[PDB]
Curated annotation (Swiss-Prot):
Domain of life, per lineage: Viruses
Function description: The maturation protein is required for the typical attachment of the phage to the side of the bacterial F-pili. Binds to sequences located toward each end of the genome, hence circularizing it. The RNA genome-maturation protein A complex is released from the capsid upon host receptor binding. Maturation protein A enters the cell along with the viral RNA.
Assembly description: Interacts with the host pilus.
Provenance organism: Pseudomonas phage PP7 (Bacteriophage PP7)
Protein name, UniProt field: Maturation protein A
Family membership: Belongs to the Leviviricetes maturation protein family.
Localization per record: Virion
Amino acid sequence: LEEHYYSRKTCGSGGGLSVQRTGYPQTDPPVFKAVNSFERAPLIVGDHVH
RNA sequence: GGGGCGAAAUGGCCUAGACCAUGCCCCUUGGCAAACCCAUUCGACCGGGUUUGGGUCUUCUGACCUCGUAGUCCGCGCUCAGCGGACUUCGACCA
């Protein structure tokens, strides 16, 4: 989205000011590809000293 | 100098008792372990002096290496290092 004021002026008669606000949806490349993973082994043995 | 004692050795007093005389108990603190210096056979030779000695970051409070001292639950499992590991405390040149 991007707004803009197409502010035009008339010929040699009057002299008024018009804002004329308008927007336009603007494209863009995709967002990052966040990655957060983790792999490990299961579980082995209960002994502690070894 | 500083204290202690009437015990403990005896003598006065000496049912008992508490004090006395000589009379006997301690302090004159102590130790650092390293590195370097002189004159010369122009080092061998004993003796002396200087820099360090738990240690840094803000050695201010307070923490970061290390340990020492204790009390408490503790694991009978979860974590890549692994592990046996947790929390709270006081001290840290040496007798």
